Design a protein around this nucleic acid. Structure first.
Ligand SMILES: [Mg+2]
Ligand SMILES: [Mg+2]
Ligand SMILES: [Mg+2]
Ligand SMILES: [Mg+2]
Ligand SMILES: [Mg+2]
Ligand SMILES: [Mg+2]
Ligand SMILES: [Mg+2]
Ligand SMILES: [Mg+2]
Ligand SMILES: [Mg+2]
Ligand SMILES: [Mg+2]
Ligand SMILES: [Mg+2]
Ligand SMILES: [Mg+2]
Ligand SMILES: [Mg+2]
Ligand SMILES: [Mg+2]
Lengths: 55, 49, 109, 117, 142, 103
RNA sequence: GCUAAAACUAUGUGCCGAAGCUGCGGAUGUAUACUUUGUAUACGUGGUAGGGGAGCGUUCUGUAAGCCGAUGAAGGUGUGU
RNA sequence: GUGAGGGGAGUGAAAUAGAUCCUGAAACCGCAUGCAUACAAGCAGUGGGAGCACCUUCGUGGUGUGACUGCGUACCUUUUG
């Protein structure tokens, strides 16, 4: 099956009106003072007062 | 400034513009070109001996 | 007023990049950078590169402070598309178009 | 003597597209639809130039009837009286007075009623 | 240009009360629709609403002539394959007179947004008392 | 205070100090025109309904000039019959200024 | 929605009702009369296939070793008339 | 990212003349401003028409949008249609 007429740009945009993105949950860490994803380990290896990959 | 190359004109009624078929609606000749609806005389080389 | 930055030849379509560009329109530079750093989209890195270029230009050439800057205007334009041939079944062939886009970012204040 | 059809065709298309500003969809961008839209608009204007007079006459008659029934009469009786009273005021001025000047319309209705008797 | 139209901001609507006991449905409905559309005012315009508010009292006391008390049938249809409901005038005026008057008046009014706005200016109550006492309605003959 | 006058086959309700437009008249610019055929004169409460004509009433006005209205396009077309035509029109008019309604 | 009708039979007063007729302005074809003779007068002016008449734009040649043009040509894009 | 690309400086009469390089239109695709739009049904226009927003030679004016309303079933061919 295929369309019988063109779809105007208005209907196309009305259909695309549900394609908006959303932001993530970012919080400031209490220990390192850096922005990080909530409930996630910081990129340096720190999470909840603990430090992985001791250097 | 008479008798110049830009001051000469022919007599009235001596020159005419030739008919051009198929050049719009307002031209009067129109779409078919004076040949009418389909038929043997409407095709190219349309005519009996 | 506005410090501009252009990125041409992004090797991505405009429709996929506008979704990311709509997120940071009107935000501050810090919030926009934080949003772009923790995203998993492909155009995010290109938008972040363009924004960092705009901020660096504003800091160096016009000598504007970074804490007062915000994303004033941002948009995506179409670009040159490459044309390739894909072989289909029963000997038929189709035309594939690899799309490219340009990104324009102007930071103000 | 080769002739190219660029300039004059572009100018004709531009005039046709400019004559159709404000339409929706392809009626303002595509030439093929804009031409038909302009022709249909011309025909509709030609017809409404005739319909407008009937519409306004009906409006005037309705307002005059409202005023006459306010003054204790009908449209037919008031028109008959005004024709018998030798008054030649048209319906436009009568409707204007009925909408604006109430005492003048009351006097006209009184004269028509007196002429009817 | 001299012919002017009514400004919708300058139109004023006044309240009236009509008693519907022992009156024929058709004539009362025509009069109500005429006074509701605004044909009685000299500033009448077809595209502006200049009518008045009409409150009907004693809605169940309306009467019809002949044998229309049992033969007048009202039909409605839900778009389900077998949903054709049919009711009589007697039961309908017994338990819902407002539907009767609303149908009778809507049948004689224009069909469109203006008609939808005009039909809202009519109130119908079965009892002999109405809550719109603050607007100070004036009694109307018929 | 207003009057009802006849001009150009139509009727107009005029008030003193008003600019109106009527059909094209042969009167040259700057000249004065007096309508001696008044249908009605209203002085607020004094109503004179001169059914044939108000006797002894005249309305004097001045000619401002002559002009033409904006262009109007007439288009005729018969579908699938190979027939269409176009035309333009601009109607003439004369501008009048009511000076006095003495009467 | 309509029952001494908002139905039917007959009759009388009024009114509504089209691009029909009349009122005002303008355009055009034919035919006659005029004392330069282009203003009046009468008849007209729906239209396919068709026949007749008059014109608008584009390229090139003579007029043109002329005229316009870096004080801005051609082209593109808006506005006014 | 010693990439592509861009912002400064400079050359140039001119750099939206920067090598994808004279002028550079339409279909097609973004951004900003002004108005309208989430209880009302159809070739999407036309004749009226309130309000709103900027202009002013401040108006019985201009430029945009235009709720509400009467009417209104595309174009070309072939056909008695
Ligand atoms: Mg023909
Ligand atoms: Mg045949
Ligand atoms: Mg033949
Ligand atoms: Mg008529
Ligand atoms: Mg005729
Ligand atoms: Mg003809
Ligand atoms: Mg030459
Ligand atoms: Mg030449
Ligand atoms: Mg210049
Ligand atoms: Mg040339
Ligand atoms: Mg509703
Ligand atoms: Mg709404
Ligand atoms: Mg309109
Ligand atoms: Mg054919």
């Amino acid at each position: 099956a295929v369309q019988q007429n063109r779809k105007s740009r208005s209907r196309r945009d009305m259909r695309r009106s549900h394609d908006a993105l959303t932001e993530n949950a970012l919080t400031v860490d209490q220990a390192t003072g850096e922005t990080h994803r909530r409930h996630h380990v910081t990129k340096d290896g720190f999470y909840r007062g603990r430090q992985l990959f001791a250097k | 400034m008479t008798l110049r190359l830009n001051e000469l004109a022919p007599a009235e009624g001596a020159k005419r513009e030739h008919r051009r078929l198929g050049r719009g609606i307002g031209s009067g000749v129109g779409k078919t070109g004076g040949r009418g609806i389909k038929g043997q005389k409407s095709r190219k080389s349309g005519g009996v001996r | 007023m506005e410090v501009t930055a252009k990125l041409r030849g992004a090797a991505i379509s405009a429709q996929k990049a506008r979704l990311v560009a709509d997120l940071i329109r009107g935000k501050s530079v810090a919030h926009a950078l934080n949003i772009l750093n923790f995203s998993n989209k492909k155009a995010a890195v290109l938008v972040k590169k363009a924004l960092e270029s705009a901020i660096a230009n504003a800091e160096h050439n016009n000598s504007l402070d970074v804490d007062d800057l915000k994303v004033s205007t941002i948009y995506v334009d179409e670009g040159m598309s490459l044309k390739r041939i894909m072989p289909r079944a029963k000997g038929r062939a189709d035309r594939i178009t690899k799309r490219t886009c340009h990104i324009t970012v102007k930071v103000g204040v | 003597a080769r002739v190219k059809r660029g300039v004059v065709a572009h100018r004709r298309h531009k005039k046709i597209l400019a004559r159709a500003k404000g339409y929706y969809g392809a009626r303002s961008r595509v030439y093929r639809v804009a031409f038909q839209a302009v022709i249909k608009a011309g025909q509709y204007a030609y017809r409404d130039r005739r319909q407008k007079k009937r519409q306004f006459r009906a409006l005037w008659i309705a307002r005059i009837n409202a005023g006459a029934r306010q003054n204790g009469l009908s449209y037919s009786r008031m028109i008959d009286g005004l024709k018998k009273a030798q008054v030649i005021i048209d319906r436009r001025v009568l409707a204007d007075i009925a909408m604006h000047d109430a005492v003048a319309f009351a006097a006209l209705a009184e004269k028509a009623k007196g002429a009817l008797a | 240009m001299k012919t002017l139209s009514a400004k919708p901001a300058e139109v004023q609507h006044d309240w009236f009360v009509v008693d519907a006991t022992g009156k024929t449905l058709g004539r009362l409905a025509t009069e109500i629709a005429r006074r509701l559309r605004g044909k009685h005012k000299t500033s009448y315009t077809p595209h502006v609403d200049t009518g008045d508010y009409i409150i009907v009292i004693n809605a169940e006391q309306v009467q019809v002539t002949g044998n229309k008390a049992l033969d007048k049938k009202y039909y409605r249809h839900t778009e389900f394959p077998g949903g054709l409901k049919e009711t009589n005038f007697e039961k309908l005026v017994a338990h819902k007179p407002e539907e009767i008057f609303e149908r009778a008046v809507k049948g004689m009014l224009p069909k469109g947004p203006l008609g939808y706005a005009m039909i809202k200016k009519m109130k119908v109550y079965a009892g002999s008392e109405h809550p719109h006492a603050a607007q100070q309605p004036q009694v109307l003959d018929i | 205070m207003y009057a009802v006058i006849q001009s150009g086959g139509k009727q107009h309700r005029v008030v003193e100090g008003e600019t109106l437009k009527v059909e094209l008249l042969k009167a040259e610019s700057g000249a004065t025109i007096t309508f001696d055929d008044v249908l009605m004169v209203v002085n607020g409460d004094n109503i004179q309904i001169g059914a044939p004509v108000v006797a002894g009433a005249k309305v004097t006005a001045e000619v401002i000039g002559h002009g033409r209205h904006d262009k109007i396009r007439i288009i005729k077309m018969r579908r699938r019959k190979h027939y269409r035509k176009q035309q333009g029109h601009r109607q003439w008019f004369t501008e009048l200024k009511i000076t006095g309604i003495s009467g």
